[PDB]
Symmetry: D2
């Protein structure tokens, strides 16, 4: 019964330890329910199962700030970081304390009385963001933040006769249908077509191709409402644009009267060595999207911040764009604590130092193993290792997993492995990660050599 | 500085009490930051400000299961219920305990190791839902659940050559751009057009108009992929369809080979007197959307549940449709606790009993006040009172607010006032809500009767100015006697007619 | 060589007679060139080939006003009438004389000097059309006339925020991509999708379904710019709406602020017993489309006539909507002569009298042959016979062809056979057509009886 | 009454000459009916009215092959050529004779019996066109030919999952809503939006920008069904692409599996010095569009010619794409006669020779008048003179009109004046046109020097 299932799960939530028999029963039950009620594809394509040993690797609790402990007591150093969620580590005490304090008062707002933490977070974000960014709309995810940015741009530009949107190939802006029209990967989009009309893509980091697109749109009467881009493409493989590119896009948008939307869902909250990646060139977009790390690794949250000029489209009818849970007190408490931690501990400067050290180590391994590795790239703690092929990349991800270092990479998506550890990763843990990567590459080379000896 | 602002907010999060001077400083700061950084429109159109007195009504903490306490210590009975979020009350101890226990272990998942609570919640939801609904996709909101439903329908129907979607007028399915294409209100959609192509709308509760839309699409080669609808329209004003309508939509979808998507974001989790409103007629949709109360009034969560036939479009590439935070352990712990509370306390049966009692009371008040009230409607704890006009509805919402009974209604959207209390509302509190509604209606009638008496006594022809001024003076002095004073002035006017 | 091919065709154009050997060589050459350069499907699905005997039936010259003579000297009474083109017969002497006179002066306009016949035809059409219809735009076909109507409606309604168009199922408005968005037949539209957005269809002749569509569009913010419909559906099978329907659509369009577009490409120029079918109920559309018979059966022409209120969208920039050949002197001369013939000879009144007689004859045959015929329908000289099935309808079309009476119907589209003879068809020829139809039905019944007896 | 109006017009059609009083009455009536029933905008923006003197310039008859005579007896040398319709001159006797002969037999087809001239013209066009172009679909105009090309590309490419179309900025492909989606001018498109989805534009003559568009579409899952372009842009101002460009577009279409549609409605039928402009580089498109001069300056006609690979999408249901009047006997007779005239008289070679002579003359005038003329461009008899500004260009068009030489140019669209005379323009007339252009420029310089 649903009653029995819920009671069994509540008992598991209360438990902190599992002996060998309790672990075996739990892991088996979890794998069965993933197969019958979640998605059997997760069992086929995840290294927590393909390289998870006899019982599979099932989550249990956070170990220390930068580690996770599975149901078998295995401790993993976290270099996946939820793809940029865990900037301040796992269960950061300041974030956890803020969420616990707010939970004791009121976790969700009434939807009528003015809610103080929405006002405090909006004020704090206005102080933290560059130039004229002043108003914030709160939501629950990165894709919701991008939907709110596209809607602000539409409400501002439709009365001005502009409806077209330009995005870049390789871009990832979310999977809800509005955000998916800007998202560029063919496999994510094709089954869901037709998407929103008037979305066009140009190569990322190519200013002349962007100018051509905006100019051709102007000549044909399909004037561009907004350009949307990530400062550095995450899902696209940690693709850095040429220096000056973001400043050139800003000038182009000003020239054509298009709004500039910067998607900092992955680069935001200190990851690239500054609070926002737009700060490396001192660029101020018209609309800024945040999510992932803004919730401190404790709550889901998204935020869309804009100038008063753009945001004022929501003033006459404040119910035009809304969300039920967006800006709830628990999420705001987590975000306020995260901003406090990042600034008090100077974690963006730590991301620059640790990211330079890790990227130097990965680049040196790339030089030593050109038979396996193509290139290592990064800015701050947003890094990627590109392998010679998908099979090699998945073998590296699986080997690191067996060495208890968690990295990105699924069975058919592992040619480029993103490395995004918490900004709180210790210097000793940075050294352990490099040592593990070297051991994995050495083991992989031996396996390839032993396969070539058998065939010869 | 951002550091100083965050430290000041963390200090506020740590406080549990506020004296009069701390309340005044906090309320003033909150109003200023809403104006400068949130939306000055909230200050103009919300009754927490227009009927909030000298300092405004600012949130502070939950009082009891069914009440909220503002920064001034004023306690409100909650009949708004976050528009259907607070089904198990405010800070339900079982839900709060589950979230606290999970926070001590791991609040957000790794995105690699298998996460147990996602598997437990998916299993519990399969056991709770009707028929062949078996697989769940977790997300963070109602609009995300509807986006996932539209995407499941698209991935299944595009290889079968079907792309069109039918929704109903009055429908509300969310405000993200995919969901907004199904959402029907013109004011929510027009500034954002063009939306997705191939969305059409038919009147809600009209099966022949739905059949015509499906058939005309078939004839022109624009075959319908899916029909999406709420079992009862919430935002549309608590609109109940005719008996048998949901079963008739199910048969029509089967006949045309269209998928049926039932949006139970507002009706789900016991609100209408059953766990899901589709259980009143025993209808099984192909896809079911949940959110709002699924998070227990503690966490944001959404869920899209489908048959294995439909959901299997995601098996070959389980990364085709994903969400970063969706299905996180805190949200799953809150949902598992909510389902446990609803079943252990049989809150859906309580929603039927309390909803019947409240709706009987509102219907009796509608009979007594046809000058102000057009109709009272509802199913379980999903109710609405429709007033004669917007102004009257906002006066009722403001009067209930002054009596510390929180109801729906904003300055320009108050002709229909939704009443969606927690399913845990006590029988005593149900009686108090009815008494407050009667007091609000009686106060509103006094204001109207006085206004009509002032305009009639000024225009009575056969009365002298000494008499006219004395009646007008008595109306100002005693507004409760407005009906009696008008009858006395009318009798004297007829008696002093030209002989 | 192209030179040799063109010289051979010019020699054929000059020839008026063909002996048996010349006919055999010509028919064989025509069939071969249709297979190799036109479309081999015409040879498979046309009764001029499937019921064309040993040599096929190839066109040669017009016989009398209502007849055609093939390359073998076979004379056919024309009841197909080019689907409503030949209203004033084949080679009507008044139309032919006007075209010959204009050809001796200037057949095509300069595109600079003001062309007199465009001005004369626009004036004549304003006098002929009801109420406030005053301005004409000339083009070359029915589908071009519909494109011009949709463009007039778009230019008027887009500044008023209305973009949606309502058409009816069964409707046929042309096959160019704009007109095809209103055209309703699935097989004509599906390979060409996506078509224009915002086009929606309701059942023809159902006023409540049209009111629902307009009302739902208003509620959702997709307000209807225009409603387009035929007064009687031609391609849809001669579908007559209930009496009062066109007047009710006019009132509904006025109520919602939508424009009314009447497509009279098939019903126009006297075919239904009045000059325009909208005259039966005295309905004035905002825009009226004409083509087919407007060219007198001699020239291609189309015309889109609108009120000054709507047409004035073209006044500030008279080059906004144009055509290269539209309104040329030959086409205008043919149209002016056609209007003169229809009015001088009272051909709309003749269409009413002859149409009532032919439809009475067909309905009596339907009464006698319910084993083959389902129903006969019509208004004036726009008629149709619906058979029990496609096979039976094609057998009737083929039998009439063997009796030298030309009717509509192709191999896989013959359940409903349209009958649209010239309005000049003599009373003696009306009687011959009914006698030929009776002979065809009697022959068809015998064949069915002889087949049912063989299987028993 | 409509009966009285039609009788009055039939009387005018029968008249061959007009005296001074008949001309005055006719011109006044024509201007009034244009104002009240056609479009009053034509009276404001046309040089036949703004530079038409006391009575306006109203058409009456063709003078000789290369001249037009108005209602006042004024004879104009035609360098406008209907923007590329009058390739074989006005009332070419071979074309007129063919149309008259066919009118005596059957002007419009039955829509059932096989019509011989449709088969003869399709055969002649297959012999005339390059490589694998074999099947023809006949229609009535350039915009209809483009609609048929877009539909052939859609029916071939939709089962292959490709729906996007690439056209170039500056392109003109017609004004019906499907063709208008490819047509690039903002003023022609904006009032009619939303047009067909999935249409994009790249700069004309820029192969790398076209490759980027095709590649970005491939990466996002919006694969391109077809590329559509003119070999030389007409309405865009006689814009010649770089050498090798059409061959590079052909290779790029083959690489991405997109169809190549060449719109030769303006360049076709000998105008650029070859029968089709695609013959200069020997490029074979998948679909070729023709119209304008294909009707010999006597009939409206359009043709869409394609390979059997593409056209075969219409074989299973030959009624899928149709047009009532398309391929009618009068139009086919006119086209057969036009092809016969062009080949017998080698008019494409004459267009190359006369075009070189005219463009040399215009380029010499550009060198002498840089104060008024920016540049002269052309290929064969498709030419343009670009002026320093719109006002100067309209002054040139108006001055040439007063010297009885008809050129393109309207009040607000005259910065680039297209010169597209009949290919039959005599060598003497070429010299007279150059002399009139010099006189017009000299008179314009005097008027500017008056202000300065
Ligand atoms: C740049 C970017 N935009 C948007 C998103 C979507 O955010 P969410 O998964 O929270 O919907 C992501 C998530 O990976 C992202 O990296
Ligand atoms: C029926 C219905 N669907 C969808 C939604 C949207 O949910 P959310 O506000 O969480 O995006 C709501 C919320 O009001 C709803 O009532
Ligand atoms: C009602 C109607 N509209 C439009 C058209 C299309 O006209 P055309 O074939 O001349 O393009 C037709 C032709 O059959 C028609 O009957
Ligand atoms: C290149 C081109 N394509 C298409 C067209 C449209 O032809 P029509 O005006 O006959 O519709 C033209 C006419 O100017 C043209 O030059």
């Amino acid at each position: 019964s649903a009653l029995a299932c819920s009671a069994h799960a509540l008992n598991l939530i209360e438990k902190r330890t599992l002996d060998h028999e309790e672990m075996k029963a739990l892991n088996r039950e979890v794998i069965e329910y993933f197969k019958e009620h979640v998605n059997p594809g997760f069992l086929e394509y995840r290294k927590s199962v393909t390289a998870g040993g006899d019982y599979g690797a099932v989550e249990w609790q956070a170990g220390s700030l930068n580690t996770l402990v599975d149901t078998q007591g295995q401790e993993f150093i976290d270099c996946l970081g939820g793809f940029g969620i865990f900037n301040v580590g796992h269960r950061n005490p300041v974030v956890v304390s803020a969420v616990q304090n707010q939970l004791a008062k009121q976790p969700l707002h009434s939807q009528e009385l003015l809610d103080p933490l929405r006002a405090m977070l909006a004020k704090t974000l206005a102080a933290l963001t560059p130039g004229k960014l002043k108003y914030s709309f709160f939501c629950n995810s990165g894709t919701e933040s991008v939907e709110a940015a596209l809607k602000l741009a539409k409400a501002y530009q439709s009365p001005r006769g502009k409806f077209t949107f330009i995005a870049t190939s390789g871009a990832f802006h979310g999977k809800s249908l509005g955000a998916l029209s800007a998202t560029a990967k063919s496999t994510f989009r094709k089954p869901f077509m037709p998407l929103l009309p008037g979305f066009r893509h140009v190569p990322f980091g190519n200013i002349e191709a962007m100018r051509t697109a905006l100019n051709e749109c102007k000549k044909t009467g399909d004037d561009v409402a907004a350009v949307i881009l990530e400062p550095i493409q995450g899902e696209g493989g940690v693709i850095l644009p040429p220096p000056g590119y973001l400043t050139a896009v800003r000038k182009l948008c000003d020239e054509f009267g298009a709004l500039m939307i910067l998607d900092e869902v992955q680069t935001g909250m200190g990851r690239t060595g500054k609070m926002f990646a737009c700060e490396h060139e001192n660029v101020q977009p018209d609309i800024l999207c945040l999510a992932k790390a803004l919730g401190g690794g404790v709550m889901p949250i998204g935020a869309t911040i804009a100038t008063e000029e753009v945001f004022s489209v929501l003033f006459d009818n404040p119910f035009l764009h809304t969300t039920t849970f967006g800006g709830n007190p628990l999420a705001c408490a987590a975000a306020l604590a995260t901003i406090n931690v990042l600034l008090e501990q100077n974690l963006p400067a730590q991301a620059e130092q640790k990211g330079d050290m890790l990227l130097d180590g990965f680049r040196q391994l790339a030089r030593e193993y050109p038979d396996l590795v193509q290139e290592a790239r990064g800015k701050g703690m947003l890094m990627a290792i590109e392998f010679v092929d998908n099979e090699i990349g998945y073998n590296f991800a699986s080997e690191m997993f067996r060495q208890r270092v968690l990295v990105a990479g699924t069975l058919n998506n592992a040619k480029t492995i993103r490395i995004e550890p918490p900004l709180t990763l210790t210097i000793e843990q940075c050294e352990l990660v490099i040592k593990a990567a070297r051991k994995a590459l050495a083991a992989m080379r031996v396996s390839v050599e032993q396969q070539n000896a058998f065939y010869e």
